[model samples]
Target: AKIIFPEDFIWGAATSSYQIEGAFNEDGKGESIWDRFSHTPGKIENGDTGDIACDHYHLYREDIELMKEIGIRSYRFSTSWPRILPEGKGRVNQKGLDFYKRLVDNLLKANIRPMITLYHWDLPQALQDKGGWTNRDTAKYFAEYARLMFEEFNGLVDLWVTHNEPWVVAFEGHAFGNHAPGTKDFKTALQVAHHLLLSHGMAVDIFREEDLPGEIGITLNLTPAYPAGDSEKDVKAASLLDDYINAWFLSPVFKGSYPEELHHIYEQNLGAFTTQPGDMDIISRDIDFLGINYYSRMVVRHKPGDNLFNAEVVKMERPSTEMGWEIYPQGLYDILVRVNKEYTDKPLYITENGAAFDDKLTEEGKIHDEKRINYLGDHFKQAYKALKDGVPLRGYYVWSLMDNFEWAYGYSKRFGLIYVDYENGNRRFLKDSALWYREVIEKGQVEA
Candidate 1:
């Protein structure tokens, strides 16, 4: 069978500034938390820092040509918060702003719509020095930062996302201390979560006040949850995980409230994380669309005393990625359908959905990553399935366009359709998967 997408369906790819741009402190760019975190002892794998990442900071033109060749209709990349605002607030960095100015100009020249994200986990170190997201003042700074971006690129950018994966920013960075600005306290994490949402709302309000010609939304990394066993305990575990991971962010945005049961549970354990009155109303400001990044589903089992919710994600008996995430493309369909049914009926976009595999360049200077191809192909089919079910998915962007810095995992993971030769001057080459994706885009269909 062949699955064909609508003629207007957007085919795209995603990347973040810290992951690819590099030039960490060049041209008046300020230091970011990732730069500091990766530089610290034992923070990143192989002592890797995004200091020079893919050098996309200098080679974006070449990359755009590659995207044009791959027929990507939209290119979703992020602005480095520190790059534009060396202090995260106050002082415009003209050179830093010009980088993206050129990037958007080139993307338009190539007929690729630019989808820009304001934040993708790269908080300015200056802000971190002043308490970062845990402090409510950071949210106010974020709004000022958003206003700058809207003023600078409003006409050029038609697609905007305020934050990318606020949960991971809050939980992984603060609660678990796995990412930059690493703080190991769940209470601080909850405070950070509330601040991130507030920042997003503030940005949305600016977008409205300006009446910018573009649509703005937030990109959430969502996962469906499933019980690992038929037992009642396992079912409850899955439900709790759902509320924690999925509903925690979704509820405030769509329903203007946190899940009440969850509030009680957290209060009993971690204590209440306070929110001011009308905060929910601001957060629930209607958005033009939703951007979802779905890579895997959560299969949970009861694990009393393990952590909050007494739930632990369990391994599934299925193929997996280099990141060890289960390769269950159906989860993409499941999440798209569920979000549409339970939340807003606004348009949706798969902002990031792709996998990492062990990729190597052959002696012929070619990379034949059949695993990546199969992974994306299966996911594309599932996306079509969700669309047919009336899920209103308007676009689908692969997780990345090329291999670059993989955060804490560093360069150990490769999720790119275009393989980057880190050892060979960061040269980019189209993998077999990129070629396959090109064909799929040209035809607007994938065969199953």
Candidate 2:
């Protein structure tokens, strides 16, 4: 079967501020927790830090040249929070702001649309020291940061994203202790999730006030949960997974509150997000689109748990990504339908979806990453199904344009369609998947 994308469908790639731009301390930028975490011993794989990633700061023109060569008409990137609000509030870093000002101008000059993300988990360490997302104050700090960007670059960055993925920030970083500023406290994680969403709502309010041009929304990392069987126990397990993993954030943003079941799971110490005067109204503020990052799914069997949640996720028995995520495409379709039907009817965008794989260049200088090729083709088929079902999906941006840093995994995992040779700072444009992507973008179609 062959699937053709709409003629107006956008073709672009996404990257984060900290992951790709690594003049970490230059241009008066304040330190972020990621800078502190990456420098800590035994924190990142290979003790690798994103000190000079892609040199995109100095070599952005060349990178833009490559993007144009590969038919990328738009670029989704983040603005470092601390870079703009040096103290997280009250003061602005002019030089740090100037750097992004240059990058946006350069991108527009190259005739590329710039999609700006406000936060991608690089909370200012100073703010984190004061409680980070765990404290409700972080929500106000995020709003300040968004206002600073909106005031400075309102016309330049029309397509605005409030946050990259709050679930990953709260659960992976605070709860699981697997990512930056790692903490294993469960209560703190739940609190962090509430504050993150509160922060997003605050940002959305800022956009509405400023009347920004293109669009405003947040990006979420969503995956489907499948039961091991059709029993009632299995069905309950799936509901719990969806409530905590999927419903936790979007339910509040679109519906203006968290799921009752989720609060029940947390019990008395649920860290309930109170309706702060105007918080719910701010969150439910109308927006142009919702960005979803769908990569894979989780297949689980019921397991008895000791306390509150009373459930656990059994690992799938299958080959996983470099990040140990199970590969599943139908999950993307499932989310698309669920979001379009049960959640907001606003236009949607697949802002981030790609995986880390061990890729290498051949002696003939070809990096044949068939795994990535098949991953994308299969996912696009699912997306096609959503489009046929009347889901107003407007665009899909690959998770990344280049392989830079993979957080705690550091430089060990390559997630880019274009491979970056870290050894001598050389870039080889030789991925079979990348070439296949160019074909898809050029023809506006994918086939199985």
Candidate 3:
């Protein structure tokens, strides 16, 4: 049997600014923290900077051409904060805005609607200098930038995402010291997370005030945690991970507060979020929909002496991807239904879903990425089930349209439906997965 999707459901692809748009300092664009991080020694794998990443800043037209060929109906992309507002607040860059305007016009001409994200973890270097997400003023500046974006791209965008994975921006960058503007400070990460959520609500408020013809929301990286065994400790660890991982962001945006148990847990030690009196009120402002970036599910066991959550994710015996993430399509269905029943009744989009795989170009310049095809095929099956189960999942966007920079790992990982020949002139070739996806979009169904 075929698992069919709704006719009006959106088929899209996702990418961030710093990950693809190279020209880090071109055309009056100021430096982003990504630019700074990638340039620093011993930071990125292979010392690769996005200085010339895919050169998409110069060849977005060609990339859009691939989208058209791949049957992608919507293009999800982010605007570099420094590109638009070089100083992160004052001094607008006409050239930077103009570049996006041109990209939007071209996408519209190609009959692809634009789904724009206001921030994708690339803060302006100037803002980082002033304490980045830890600074409350940065959230205010983000709202200012959000208002400008609303006014600039008013009717052109089909959807507006305020932030892409604030968890990553907070934990990975601030707490783990892996990503840009790196700092290994847990207390700072807490403040950053709260501020990011605050920034999101402010953007949504501005979007409403601007009365733009677009729906605005935030994209969270959600993973459903499952206990490894029937032990009480395992269950407790799983519960803790669930609260700190999924519920932390979901609660504030939907219920206007963090999970009480986890709040008490974190506040007991390294301090909790330094939230102002009305911050929760602002963070819980109503939005049009929720964007979920699902990659993998977690199966955790208790780690008795571990301070952080007292749990650690255990590797399952199931088949995994090149990224070492287990293939668990059922988690997609679980999370979608869970959110619908437990949280808001708003619509949802699988904003980012795909896998990194070891792919290579053949003598004929074609990529036979069968692993990626199976990965997406299985996930689409689950997404279809969630839709039929009455979860308001309205769209699906694969992680990338083409391979580009994969940050920290640099160009080490390939997550694109279209293969990018990096050694060559950054040329793009449609992988078998892309062809498979094109057929899925054309028919609105996948093999069950």
Candidate 4:
């Protein structure tokens, strides 16, 4: 069977500024929390800092040429927060603004729609010093930053994503302390989660108020939760995990409230906190679209003494990615269907869905990553199946266009369709998977 997409379906690739752009301290660009975190001892693998990631800061034209060559319809990229506002709030950096101005202009010239993400885990160091996302003031600060980008980019951007994976921003950064601005505290994570949603709503309000000529939304890294076994305890474990990861963010946006069970769970552990009236009102603002970042599903089993939820993710007996995530394409279909049935019917986009593999360049200067090709092909078929089931997935942007800095894991992980020669001047070479994806876009179909 052949899997085909709609004629208007958008095929794209995505990248973030800090991951690819290496000019960490150039052109009045201030420091970001990632810079500080990665530079600290024992934080990132190989002690790698994004100080010279892909050098895309200076080689953007070449990257765009590669994107053009791949025949992508759109490019979902992010701007660096510190690059725009060196202080994260006060003074505007003209040189930093000019960089993205140049980027958007070139993407349009290449006929590639530009989707801009305001934040992708790169909080300005200046803001982190002021309590980061844990402080409610940071949410208000984000709104001002979003307004700046909207006013500046105006008509050039095709879409605006206020936050990329607020769950990661809150849970990973605050709860687990695995990401930048790392802090291992559940109470802080809950506070940060609330603030991120508030900021998203504030940005949506700004977009509507300014009559911006593009769509505005948030990107969620969603995972379907499954019980590890046919047991009541395992089922409850899966439900708790679902409420923690998937519903925690989704509920506030779609239902204007947090999952009551999870909220009570947190309250019992972290004590009660005041919620100012109208906070939920701000969070449930209408959005033009929803961006879902799917990679895999979580299979959970009951675990005694677990702090947040009495559950732990268990390994599945399945093919896995270099990141150790299970390769389950059906999970993508399940999540798309669930979101559509339980939430808004607004258009959805696969903002980030790709895997890392132990890819290496052969002596022929080619990377024949068949495993990645198979992984994406299977997921594409599932996405097509979901669409047929009436899920309005309008677009799909691969996790990355090229390999760059993988946070915590650092450069140890490579998820891009295009392989980057980090030892060889950061040169980009299209892998076999990329070649396969090119045809998928060109033909609008996945052939068996």
Write model 4 residue lDDT over 1-448, tens digit each, in one string. Answer: 3577888899999999999999999999999999999888978999999999999989999988999999999999988989999888999999999999999999999999999999988899999999898778888888999999999889888699999999988888988998888789877888888889998999899999999888888899899999988989999889998988889899999989999998898888787655689999999999989999999999888888555578888987788999999999998998999999998899999999999999989988799999999999889889999999989999999988999999999999999989999989788889998889999998889987
Cα-based lDDT for every prediction: 0.91, 0.82, 0.91, 0.90
The sequence of per-residue lDDT tens digits that candidate 1 reaches over residues 356-443 is 9999899887999999999999999999999998898999999899998888999999989899998887898899999999989998
Order by lDDT, highest first: 1, 3, 4, 2
TM-score of 1: 0.99
- What lDDT tens digits, residue by residue, belong to model 3 across residues 1-448? 4577778789999998988889999999998889999989988999999998889999899999999999899999989999999999999999999999999999999999999999998899999999898899999999999999899888888799999999888988998998988889888988999999999998888889999987888899999999998999899889998888789999999999899898997999876567899999999999999999999999989986556678888988889987789999999999999999998899999999999999988999889898899889989989889988879999999998888888899999999998888778888899999999999999988885
Q: Compute the lDDT for candidate 2.
A: 0.82
Clashes of 1: 0
Per-candidate TM vs. native?
Answer: 0.99, 0.95, 0.99, 0.98
Off by over 4 Å in 3: none
Q: After superposition, how far is residue 251 of candidate 1 from its true place, in Å?
A: 0.5
**Global CA lDDT computed for model 1:** 0.91
Runs in model 1 lying further than 4 Å from the true structure:
none
**Residues 72-140, model 2: lDDT tens digits:** 778999888887776787788888888788888888998888999889988998899899887788899
Which of candidates 1 and 2 is the stronger one according to TM-score? 1
